[PDB]
Symmetry: C4
Subunit: 364 residues, 4 copies
């Protein structure tokens, strides 16, 4: 039997590194390997966190700032901070209460929750746990069957999704050698995609291969036609990918390399953000993720063209140790660090962060 | 008595690093040192594998790709993948069945086998083991005696060689200090070059010095005159070397630094490929080798101007552990990784890989 | 009870690294952690010392130099060397005699002493210990209350401060995780700021938050209006910060990142010095600090536009082990190294150092 | 009593790294520390050997080369190879037979021997040991007394010195902290400089301070006036130093940073060679040293503008273990490696090395 974390309450940590280590005590070895590792030789995975010091934040002085405000106005939403929950599969790997605990905690922090197509819970349970005023987005792993795709989009609409995130950088799984060494298989169902994927006893490789490989601009047009919700393309790391996405009617761009879990030997996401921000030229919102472990990383991403920054692994480690309380403590850690960075950089508001100029590191 | 690997069947490995370590259990210490190490302080040897992350592969999205096809049309050949066997001396160091096992396995995978002048078997045995439809090339370590050179070329013709690979970067042996520490000598004859070299009990240094040092463009003209087979020059790493080769009538260029076994303090082969591809300007085919351990390395070489990528040490480690089955499993490992990279990069066919644009890594 | 160093006399050390290690034997663990560590992941802290080899000193020959002279004419002062004491809080953490021992030792060496607002002693005790001819500057952590600010400035005037150093890069404390792990609190009062801060049992974070966060150019104008002393802005690392400071009437610029204790992910101070020196264009004096551990670091800073270089941690380690004798030995170590560097670089006087041209390191 | 090496005969080594380690068995700890270490934090010392891979040697093919010839015509001399003995103090630290053993071995190899002013033997003994046809140069540490300087120059003339090497980069000693830790003092006299320096029981720092600090172009004119021998300036690493030297009548330039023993935080000598070669523009010969441990290092220096390359520490380690036989084996190691590099680079003669083009390493 697979037994995940069961604690609901305050957790003890200093930073995201000791939090990651502490989670090894409550997540079964195979599940921990699935969450913690990445593709191939882990070049791209390691580069994600290193890349934030490719650009240096200037601690400006005499900027007439106190009590910096992380409050973020995004569409008709008011967020506590420009920090959201990334779509992460199978929260039941981390905590018994799974996406019910994560959706409740992110709702209570007061920011956007992105639900995974590969969730351990139904979208109905995710909406119920967050409450009716919780801002929730739906991340779509599409079927090869358009009937099933219409059914999943109608289901996202019923549950009040405010955007559809088409993940386009996992048409097949990466060469995740920790999963291979562990003989990893999923312990729980995936109810949202149950029409094409059963989850239980399936390999990582098998699950991605059950979804659609031949994604194209026609898939954005399909989602627009049948849902009327704004479409974000996730995995965008170049100008060519921006123009393909916007020409097909995308209303958002999500810069990511899937936390270094996919194509080893590719760039760090933070380096790609510069190319993507130039191509987008503020025409649509940008979400950024992959390697974020400090407030200074969030500041640098927003200064470089991100409107929102998404959190993956650190939120899952917090969930494993403390449930809803634990995941909210991780968002609070990032908000508290961002407030410190805003004061020392001289930015009163999130819009002021966007206008900050970083210095390129010539000696990395 | 020298006792190499004897197993014929499926081998257990994750990647080429644990395969290299596993081979230490079946290859005698001196033979393992000869295969595994390189020249001088090993700067050039280490740089070969590191250099693939000097250029970054973009994981494009919405590229309308599924079931990527590695099938490669090269001259009148149909190859399983754009991946061939490099010429490697003395396979009897690795497996009792030597080049009979390696030629059979590479034939069954369905790609080009390059036979070494310093083989443990005759070219007749190599042709017999591969079968009459197996695509085979002949790698030439020339004699100082032109009579012997005519005899060896007529022998290559009789055995249906489709190209002659003139190896030009080993006129003398490098300073291979592992061979010195081990007191390495060859345990087996070298029948192809028996007219000038006996093999048994000879040092690495002695064998290279028995071949021709004063290679020049006149040697390409000699091979053309007497064989009528296309000549590839192997070891080409600069524009000057391309023009010398093509002006003398070469019909192919093989970019290599001999797996870091020759001139320590020289460039990584993958970095040299850019200079060579610019000079060749698609006038003749390019083969690339040295440091290839992943599908992403093959993808990057082809995107950078290679038509074919050759495998050395990893194929020999597979041979040592599993014979024909083992060497085919190594080619299958590279083909399976290349299919994963093609799907995540957005390339349907090998010609699409050639049109991919890599991003230079400004933070190596 | 908190028990610091008590020795007054000569100490045994080779360089500042073994001095830092030796101090662990006499400074209580919590105090040692407070002095020795820095912010976040310590990127900026480590980069400070590494950055001095971003620029290379040319050992010129035949320069007609002997007995190089470090004597420095600064305003109406004659200093032994262009090397001064940085403002460092709470010397009682290091030695029982606290700022009485440090002010006496720096006076006897013959250079500027910068008194911290967060001193363990009164400014009256600091002036008494240095003697009436000792050059002393006052470092200001401002109150939120302008009445208290007028009182502190009148107090600096009474004690013969020759400049006011407005520290502007610590409006809040950095994420100093060693202090968090140690549960660090200050053991002694802070008499200079007693009107707003009691010191005893207070966290690092609490003390900075008791001072003024909303520093602006109006604060320079306030100090000028009420003290008539030259104002230096400390923490300046960019052109924008120079122009803000000078436009508000600053008569000096102090380039610093607070010894890597504040905004992790910011530049090394030595790299920032180039940008600041270009903007200042010799209009006002420049003080430089953060990471100085060798004479070559002082030489490089002065060649790059610094008029004076300030010493922090190394002076405190010397104080802990030897009191007034020990801190003077640290200044003597830096002066002796600077004399060696001046002879080998070919600079007879400090003005000659300013005219030296460094070579940028293209291979860091 | 100080007891150095006593063996005369063949020594067992692979490369200069295991030779350096083996010498620890025969050189007393204090002497070994004096020979093996360098200044300050050893940045410049470590950079010397690393810097050779800042520029990459192209292994050219089809260059029509065999039996490469290292024979070097320099002035009226015929050298075995473009490889000479650097001036190194006090060979009695390494071997009982001191400079008698080193001069005999270098004479028998057939190249230039540079005698140190701080030799353990007289120049008469050095000339007698080398024989009358041995090419010998005299390295000058000048006195503050011009009478003593005239006496030393007349002595160099009597002993048939063919050049005077004015060492200009050691006007004072570097901060050699191994010597400090060891309490190092010289065990033997320095007969050449006995008029101003006794040697026995003296520190490194004291010996350099007894020589002339205020070296200037007037000192080149003095040597020319009183000896009529060509003057080389040693320690030249910039254009300014070339023009100062040539304007004063120098007939040679010796590029060096004194093996990283002097100004820590300065450039690697191999990097400085490019700047010096451009300024000299073949107007006078260039000697190069500091960090040479391989044939590829000698090749790269000559391709970059050096006419001769000098050997320091490796020659002293060979001397300690094998006397005249041992030091000749070290020169033979370098000649044998240079022959291998010349064959693989495609250079028939030393003049061909000068015309080789290196590729700058963009990924160091
Ligand atoms: C365990 C786990 C599982 C998933 C993911 C990640 C991880 C760690 N990610 C990728 C995710 O959205 C995000 O891009 C990364 O997690 C960001 O990198 P960091 O984890 O913050 O370093 C992911 N993305 C997505 O679109 N759908 C999914 O179902 C998942 N599943
Ligand atoms: C044990 C061994 C033996 C040989 C070689 C290599 C090795 C490892 N190589 C060089 C070979 O063709 C190829 O360039 C390298 O092996 C490529 O580097 P990797 O081994 O893939 O890293 C080689 N090349 C050649 O032209 N003729 C030969 O006989 C040999 N022999
Ligand atoms: C223990 C301690 C305490 C303080 C400081 C530093 C340290 C180490 N610093 C910063 C100081 O002035 C200086 O910028 C740095 O010390 C310089 O870096 P190094 O210590 O030389 O590496 C500091 N600066 C300031 O303006 N007022 C203060 O009260 C203090 N307090
Ligand atoms: C033990 C020892 C002693 C000396 C030296 C070096 C060493 C190691 N060197 C410097 C020498 O000429 C040369 O520049 C360096 O040795 C070159 O660096 P490598 O030793 O080859 O790395 C030196 N130079 C000089 O001009 N006169 C001298 O008396 C000495 N003495």
């Amino acid at each position: 039997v697979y037994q995940a974390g069961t604690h609901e309450g305050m957790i003890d940590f200093i930073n995201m590194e000791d939090l990651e280590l502490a989670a090894t005590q409550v997540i079964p070895s195979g599940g921990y390997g699935y969450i913690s590792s990445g593709a191939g030789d882990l070049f791209t995975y390691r580069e994600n966190q290193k890349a934030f010091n490719h650009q240096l934040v200037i601690p400006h002085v005499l900027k007439d700032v106190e009590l910096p405000d992380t409050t973020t106005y995004f569409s008709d939403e008011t967020l506590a901070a420009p920090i959201i929950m990334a779509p992460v599969a199978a929260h039941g790997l981390a905590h018994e209460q799974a996406e019910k605990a994560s959706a409740k905690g992110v709702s209570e922090f007061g920011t956007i929750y992105t639900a995974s197509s590969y969730a351990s819970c139904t979208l109905e349970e995710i909406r119920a746990a967050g409450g009716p005023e919780a801002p929730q987005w739906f991340q779509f792993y599409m079927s090869k069957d358009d009937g099933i795709n219409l059914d999943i989009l109608e289901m996202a609409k019923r549950n009040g999704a405010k955007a559809v995130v088409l993940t386009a950088d996992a048409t097949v799984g990466g060469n995740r050698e920790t999963d291979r060494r562990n003989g990893f298989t999923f312990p729980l169902p995936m109810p949202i995609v149950q029409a094409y994927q059963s989850g239980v006893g399936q390999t990582m490789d098998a699950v991605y291969k059950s979804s659609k490989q031949k994604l194209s601009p026609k898939d954005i047009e399909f989602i627009t036609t049948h849902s009327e919700l704004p479409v974000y393309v996730k995995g965008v790391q170049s100008e060519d990918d921006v123009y393909r996405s916007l020409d097909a009617g995308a209303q958002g761009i999500w810069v990511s390399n899937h936390g270094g879990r996919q194509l080893d030997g590719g760039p760090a996401s933070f380096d790609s953000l510069r190319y993507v921000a130039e191509a987008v030229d503020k025409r649509v919102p940008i979400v950024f993720d992959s390697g974020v472990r400090r407030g200074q990383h969030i500041f640098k991403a927003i200064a470089s063209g991100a409107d929102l920054v998404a959190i993956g692994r650190p939120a899952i480690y917090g969930l494993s140790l403390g449930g809803s309380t634990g995941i909210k403590q991780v968002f609070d850690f990032f908000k508290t660090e961002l407030e410190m960075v805003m004061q020392l950089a001289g930015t009163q508001t999130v819009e002021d962060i966007k206008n900050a100029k970083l210095r390129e590191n010539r000696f990395m």
